[PDB]
Design a protein around this ligand. Structure first.
Ligand SMILES: [Cl-]
Length: 204
């Protein structure tokens, strides 16, 4: 019984997921093209499969040797319009998506596109307990604020931290484990699993 995939069918979430993914890792250009950038090729493969599923044709897929990333080029008017109507501004500060986008699925997409998984440590009676943190960093304060407030509204606790080079939202411990099954980025999934390797993990 296979799960943890981006939903399809009558309650599909492909576009909502892609909205967050592309907001995180994409750029829309003057010509009407969407370019999705990812370093990790096995994640690239999953994106390609999702786009195929949505009937979105790929114009090109090429490894930018300079930047060190794979670029998926897409030329699709309906997708381009959907994206620009959900805070994905063309050029080179993002806005939150509208109410019509499934917020949980946009946020998962965004985590997959540009978030990270790390192990943090809580110090208790002279011992170090490890637990996972999912983090997003963005230059848009408005988007960061919305991600945090939106997760809080869903009942998934999130905190905020302001860094010299950007605005962070943190989803820790149990809260992160509530998102992991939905993440498509295999690097996230492996790093989450690594916390169990510690002799002292807070939750395992
Ligand atoms: Cl944990």
């Amino acid at each position: 019984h296979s799960s943890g995939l981006v939903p399809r069918g009558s309650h599909m979430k492909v576009w909502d997921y892609l909205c967050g993914l592309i907001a995180a890792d994409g750029h829309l250009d003057e010509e009407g093209y969407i370019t999705i950038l990812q370093k990790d090729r096995r994640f690239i493969d999953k994106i390609v499969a999702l786009l195929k599923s949505a009937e979105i044709k790929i114009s090109s897929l090429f490894y930018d040797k300079g930047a060190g990333v794979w670029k998926i080029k897409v030329k699709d008017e309906r997708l381009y319009r959907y994206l620009v109507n959900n805070g994905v501004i063309p050029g080179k500060v993002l806005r939150p998506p509208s109410s019509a986008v499934d917020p949980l699925w946009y946020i998962i997409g965004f985590i997959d596109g540009d978030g990270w998984v790390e192990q943090v440590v809580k110090r208790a009676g002279d011992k170090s307990y490890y637990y996972i943190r999912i983090g997003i960093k963005t230059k848009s304060k408005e988007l960061r604020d919305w991600i945090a407030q939106t997760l809080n509204d869903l009942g998934i606790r999130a905190s905020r931290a302001d860094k010299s080079d950007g605005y962070e939202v943190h989803i820790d411990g149990v809260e992160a484990w509530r998102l992991v099954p939905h993440l498509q980025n295999p690097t996230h999934l492996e790093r989450a699993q690594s916390v169990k390797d510690n002799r002292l993990s807070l939750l395992f």
